[PDB]
Design a protein around this ligand. Structure first.
Ligand SMILES: *C(=O)[C@H](CCCCC(=N)N)[C@H]1c2ccc(-c3cccc(C(=O)N(CC)CC)c3)cc2C[C@@H]1O
Lengths: 259, 10, 36
């Protein structure tokens, strides 16, 4: 996260770390949506241009975390994956359309003060909240300074970072880029004049964009961190997978297995 | 960079 | 049902459940037309 701050403890108890077994690496963010299901971006697992294609045994999931690199001994939980599900029309050839994936855990996680699922939106929640100008919040352990062009200064955080960013309108999203934007994406971020800054960055992809409902005080995940051009470049924006539009796919797969 | 995790997880 | 099981989703143990706010969530809520 660029221009964010450190998270409070337990502030985002659905944040998950995607962790490669060998070498031990942070791969991506993710999120916990029930005791057994994790949501992330498909590009975290499957990306042919860069010869990326992870399977279940390549990875661990780590839940309950705050520190990026410590093993948080009686706080975090580490889980093995049972099954990865990628959207069957994810578009890695062109624009990362349908950048979504579900991971099934081997055994259910127990919840605690630090481990707690987020909600997925319903139609009326999506409708009321997903408006230009409304802010949501992005969290993660990825770089502090741009690496699309490697940046110095500080590099990597020690703790989970957080930033709040406004939804931007669709025409400005589309006029900021040469990529074909779909209805399965939204963008977010401050406009160059607005004075405030901030963005996701490498290592943040796959994590949550969440919003808090003013009607029932719950947190909903509206976006997944997907792609962007650089990090915190003026006149550019972050693009997020639109979680509600892909919700039928999500419930299709979690209903078909299955207890 | 990462601290070592328990061998039961690998 | 009731969500994916839970039902309790989106309510954080250390915050909503004990009626504490985090240090920036008001920024979110007052962008929502402010609304109150
Ligand atoms: C995840 O950590 C990376 C950052 C995601 C969000 C970063 C941000 N909001 N600044 C993630 C990432 C970011 C950008 C790209 C990227 C840039 C430009 C074009 C494309 C591309 O290949 N397209 C599809 C063919 C068009 C959208 C991608 C890529 C990635 C991968 C990296 O893990």
């Amino acid at each position: 996260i660029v221009e964010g701050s450190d998270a409070e403890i337990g502030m985002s108890p659905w944040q998950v770390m995607l962790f490669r077994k060998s070498p031990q690496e942070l791969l991506c963010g993710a999120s916990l949506i029930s005791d057994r299901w994790v949501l992330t971006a498909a590009h975290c697992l499957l990306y042919p241009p860069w010869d990326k294609n992870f399977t279940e045994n390549d990875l661990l999931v780590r839940i309950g975390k705050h520190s990026r690199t410590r093993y948080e001994r009686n706080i975090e939980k580490i889980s093995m994956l049972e099954k990865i599900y990628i959207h069957p029309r994810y578009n890695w050839r062109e624009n990362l359309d349908r950048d979504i994936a579900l991971m099934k855990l081997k055994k259910p996680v127990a919840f605690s003060d630090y481990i707690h699922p987020v909600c997925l939106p319903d139609r009326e929640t999506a409708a009321s909240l997903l408006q230009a100008g409304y802010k949501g919040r992005v969290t993660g352990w990825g770089n502090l300074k741009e690496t699309w062009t490697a940046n110095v200064g500080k590099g990597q955080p020690s703790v989970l970072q957080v930033v709040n960013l406004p939804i931007v309108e669709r025409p400005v999203c589309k006029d900021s880029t040469r990529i074909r934007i779909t209805d399965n994406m939204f963008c977010a971020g401050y406009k160059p004049d607005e004075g405030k800054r901030g963005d996701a960055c490498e290592g943040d992809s796959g994590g949550p964009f969440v919003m808090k409902s003013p009607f029932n005080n719950r947190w909903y995940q509206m976006g997944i961190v997907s792609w962007g051009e650089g990090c915190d470049r003026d006149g550019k924006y972050g693009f997020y997978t639109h979680v509600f539009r892909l919700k039928k796919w999500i419930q299709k797969v979690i209903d078909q297995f299955g207890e | 960079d990462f601290e070592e995790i328990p061998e039961e997880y690998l | 049902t009731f969500g994916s099981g839970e039902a309790d989703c989106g309510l954080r143990p250390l915050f909503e459940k004990k009626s504490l706010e985090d240090k920036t969530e008001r920024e979110l809520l007052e962008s929502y037309i402010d609304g109150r």
